[PDB]
Amino acid sequence: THIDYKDTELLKRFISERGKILPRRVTGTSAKYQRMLTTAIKRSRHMALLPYVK
Amino acid sequence: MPRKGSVPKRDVLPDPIHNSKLVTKLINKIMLDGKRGTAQRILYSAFDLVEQRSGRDALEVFEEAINNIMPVLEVKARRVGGSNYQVPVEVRPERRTTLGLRWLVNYARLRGEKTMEDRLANEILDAANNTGGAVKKREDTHKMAEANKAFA
Amino acid sequence: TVVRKNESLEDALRRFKRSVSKSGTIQEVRKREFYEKPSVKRKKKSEAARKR
Amino acid sequence: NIENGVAHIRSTFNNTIVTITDEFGNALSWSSAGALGFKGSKKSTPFAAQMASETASKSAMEHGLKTVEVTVKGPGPGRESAIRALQSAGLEVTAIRDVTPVPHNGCRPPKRRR
RNA sequence: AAACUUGAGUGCAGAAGAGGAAAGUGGAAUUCCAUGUGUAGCGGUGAAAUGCGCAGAGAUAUGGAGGAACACCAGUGGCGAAGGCGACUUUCUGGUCUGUAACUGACGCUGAUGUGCGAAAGCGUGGGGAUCAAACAGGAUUAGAUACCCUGGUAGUCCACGCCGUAAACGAUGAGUGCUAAGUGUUAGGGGGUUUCCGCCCCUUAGUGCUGCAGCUAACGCAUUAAGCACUCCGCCUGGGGAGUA
Numbered sequence: 001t002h003i004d005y006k007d008t009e010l011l012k013r014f015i016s017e018r019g020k021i022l023p024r025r026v027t028g029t030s031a032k033y034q035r036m037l038t039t040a041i042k043r044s045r046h047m048a049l050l051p052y053v054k
Numbered sequence: 055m056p057r058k059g060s061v062p063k064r065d066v067l068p069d070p071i072h073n074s075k076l077v078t079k080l081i082n083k084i085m086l087d088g089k090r091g092t093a094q095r096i097l098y099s100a101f102d103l104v105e106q107r108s109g110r111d112a113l114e115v116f117e118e119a120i121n122n123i124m125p126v127l128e129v130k131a132r133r134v135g136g137s138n139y140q141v142p143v144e145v146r147p148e149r150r151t152t153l154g155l156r157w158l159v160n161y162a163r164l165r166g167e168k169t170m171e172d173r174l175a176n177e178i179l180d181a182a183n184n185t186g187g188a189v190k191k192r193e194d195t196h197k198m199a200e201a202n203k204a205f206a
Numbered sequence: 207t208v209v210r211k212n213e214s215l216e217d218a219l220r221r222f223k224r225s226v227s228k229s230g231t232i233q234e235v236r237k238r239e240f241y242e243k244p245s246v247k248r249k250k251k252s253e254a255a256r257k258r
Numbered sequence: 259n260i261e262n263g264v265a266h267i268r269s270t271f272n273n274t275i276v277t278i279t280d281e282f283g284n285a286l287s288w289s290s291a292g293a294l295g296f297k298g299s300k301k302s303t304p305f306a307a308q309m310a311s312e313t314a315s316k317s318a319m320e321h322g323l324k325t326v327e328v329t330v331k332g333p334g335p336g337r338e339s340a341i342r343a344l345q346s347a348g349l350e351v352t353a354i355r356d357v358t359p360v361p362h363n364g365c366r367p368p369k370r371r372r
Numbered sequence: 373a374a375a376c377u378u379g380a381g382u383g384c385a386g387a388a389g390a391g392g393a394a395a396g397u398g399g400a401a402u403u404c405c406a407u408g409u410g411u412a413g414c415g416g417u418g419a420a421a422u423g424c425g426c427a428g429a430g431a432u433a434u435g436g437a438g439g440a441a442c443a444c445c446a447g448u449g450g451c452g453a454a455g456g457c458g459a460c461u462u463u464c465u466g467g468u469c470u471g472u473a474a475c476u477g478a479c480g481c482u483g484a485u486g487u488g489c490g491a492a493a494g495c496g497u498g499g500g501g502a503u504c505a506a507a508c509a510g511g512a513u514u515a516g517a518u519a520c521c522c523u524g525g526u527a528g529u530c531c532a533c534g535c536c537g538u539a540a541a542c543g544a545u546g547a548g549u550g551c552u553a554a555g556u557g558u559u560a561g562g563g564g565g566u567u568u569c570c571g572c573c574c575c576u577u578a579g580u581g582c583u584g585c586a587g588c589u590a591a592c593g594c595a596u597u598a599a600g601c602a603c604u605c606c607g608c609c610u611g612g613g614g615a616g617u618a
Contacts (some may be wrong), residue, residue: 001570013215014445018229021445031449031559032388038445039460045399046460052362052399052443054207136418204305209353215345219338228445231358235333237267238443240370241504245345255447266432272416275431283433285410290431292413299417361401362443362459366504366529372520 003033005040008049014041019053057200063148069096072113076151080116081173083155084170107179124154125192127199142199142206161188259321265344265351267311269334273301276314276340278326286323289314307336310348327353 003011014022014037021041024034044050055061069077071179077097085093101112108115130143145153162170164187180186210218226232231255242250264283267276268355291301291310300306315326326349328341344351 016444019444020230023445023447025447027381034445035450041445042460043444046397053360204300204303206305207355207357211352215342215351218351218354219342222356223338226356229356230353231356231360232333234443235358238367241367242370251446252448264432268431273414275414277410277431279409279432283410285432288411288431290413293411297420299419359401360443362399362441364401364441364443365403365502366440367402368504 003037003040005043005047006049008044011041011044012050013036015050017054019051073114074113074116076116076120077113079151080155080159083159084174094169097174099171100178103172103175104178104182107175108182112120112178115178115182119178120154120158122181122184122189123157123192124150125195128153129193129202130200138202138205140199140205141204142203159187161186161191259323261322261324263323263326265315265326265328267328267330267337267340268332269307269330269336269340270332271302271334272299274307274310274334274336274340276311278314278318278323280323286320287314287318289317302335304336304339307340308343308346311340311343315344315347317351325350327350327351328355330354330356331358333358 005011016022021038024031027034029037036052041050045052066075066078068075070079072075081090081094081097084097101116104112104115124145126145127142128145129140131139132141133139158177158181159174162174163171165176167173167176177186177188181189208221210221259280259289263278263280263286263342265278266283267274267346272307273291275288275290277285289310291306292311293311294306294313326344328344328351331361341351341354
């Protein structure tokens with residue numbers, strides 16, 4: 001599949017308790033999932049669906 | 055052996071008159087130059103004036119006077135270099151007993167009268183009444199170690 | 207940024223001492239106390255990863 | 259103005275500084291370690307925070323602002339010892355925040371120190 | 373003079389990527405200014421001082437301007453021939469890998485001279501100037517300073533166009549193609565086998581590491597990413613200084 005940047009609820013379990021990114025070391029996702037995630041988490045920071053810090 | 059561990063501390067023999075260990079330890083510290091009898095006679099004539107200037111028996115008065123001598127905080131120097139190097143450290147109970155006996159005698163030797171017949175007993179009643187010279191350096195330690203309280 | 211109430215202050219600190227240690231504040235500003243060279247942090251991150 | 263405010267501390271590597279203000283910040287009172295006769299390098303101690311916190315809080319006295327909900331804004335040794343000593347004044351610390359400036363790799367920091 | 377398909381290249385179908393270039397967008401922080409509120413220091417160090425502040429400092433709150441970078445993700449990961457490349461979006465554009473076998477039919481490899489890229493610091497013509505900062509100024513340390521430390525600060529750091537063409541430009545190892553125990557991480561695919569309610573297992577391809585035989589080495593060590601066994605071509609060495617100097 002492909003992460004859409006509007007699907008906030010599956011995308012905000014990956015954000016931190018302040019707004020940072022959890023590494024895949026502590027989350028447990030794969031390699032290409034994590035960097036397909038991170039280009040969607042940062043387009044959602046830009047359109048205020050997720051903060052930069054809380 | 056002070057680096058193999060600790061030295062085994064040894065037992066003392068309590069006094070026959072007061073039936074007190076604390077009296078005999080005062081005998082040994084006022085024993086200048088190994089003379090046991092010529093110093094013990096003076097202590098046995100330096101609590102009769104205590105019992106003359108106060109109706110209570112002096113074995114109560116001794117352990118009441120030293121409590122205004124024995125401090126609760128002192129300074130042990132830790133080699134930190136450019137820091138204050140003066141850590142306020144509380145006192146172990148063995149050093150708590152000894153260091154009160156030390157100040158009681160070392161300022162009894164610097165009074166106006168010459169005889170330790172009454173050099174000693176004057177400072178005891180001062181320490182019994184929370185005053186004098188051996189009390190006021192406890193407060194000097196409690197104005198020095200209690201001023202540099204940033205190293206608790 | 208966590209509110210702690212219905213307790214004392216010596217237990218809200220126990221929350222707050224580990225809500226800062228699990229954050230990029232103290233380990234971040236200790237890193238940026240001085241400018242490191244742009245090829246010595248690539249080895250500093252390599253030593254902080256090969257040891258894990 | 260009574261019993262509503264924001265407490266700001268920012269303990270750096272020197273000279274723990276504290277300014278208590280209202281909830282819409284207007285600098286009610288402040289104190290430092292230098293304002294207590296600590297001239298230099300004794301100010302970087304938790305014991306300096308033991309007195310500097312309440313001597314601004316208790317010497318506020320203009321409105322009776324007796325709640326704080328403190329804010330931490332500095333990496334320092336007397337960081338948590340300035341909020342522990344704030345309940346010596348006893349002002350119901352209810353919301354502790356570590357709002358410290360953390361850059362997004364923005365500017366060039368100064369040189370290494372040999 | 374013909375014939376072939378493996379090498380090489382194009383198709384077709386899938387991917388992955390901080391590969392470049394140009395134009396936009398965005399947030400945190402730094403500095404400066406304007407304002408509100410507010411009061412004695414702030415700052416700095418092994419200790420201080422220079423410096424700053426009562427012409428309201430710092431601290432705090434809002435707003436503004438401007439320049440520079442892009443926290444987290446971020447990893448002995450990815451990409452590029454090397455230098456190198458890290459916010460986000462769009463346009464323009466280069467390369468690699470996998471699989472299929474349709475097609476071309478040795479079209480290949482290396483490459484002197486040549487011609488182009490090439491970190492930083494520099495230089496030129498203009499911009500821009502926030503932090504940082506050679507030179508420089510001042511305060512401390514020391515036995516002594518032009519060092520270290522601290523305050524301040526110019527060129528520079530940044531952009532545009534021309535240059536310069538050098539680095540411990542390093543894997544101190546040229547490129548190409550074969551062949552030669554294995555074990556193990558990881559990245560990008562593919563075909564399987566169960567099936568998993570998207571997670572493993574085995575085989576294979578191309579990268580990227582860590583161990584380790586044979587063999588090699590003067591010894592350390594290297595070991596399918598050779599420094600092993602071969603063949604082609606190119607660069608280069610033949611005592612140390614004098615010297616990468618006349």
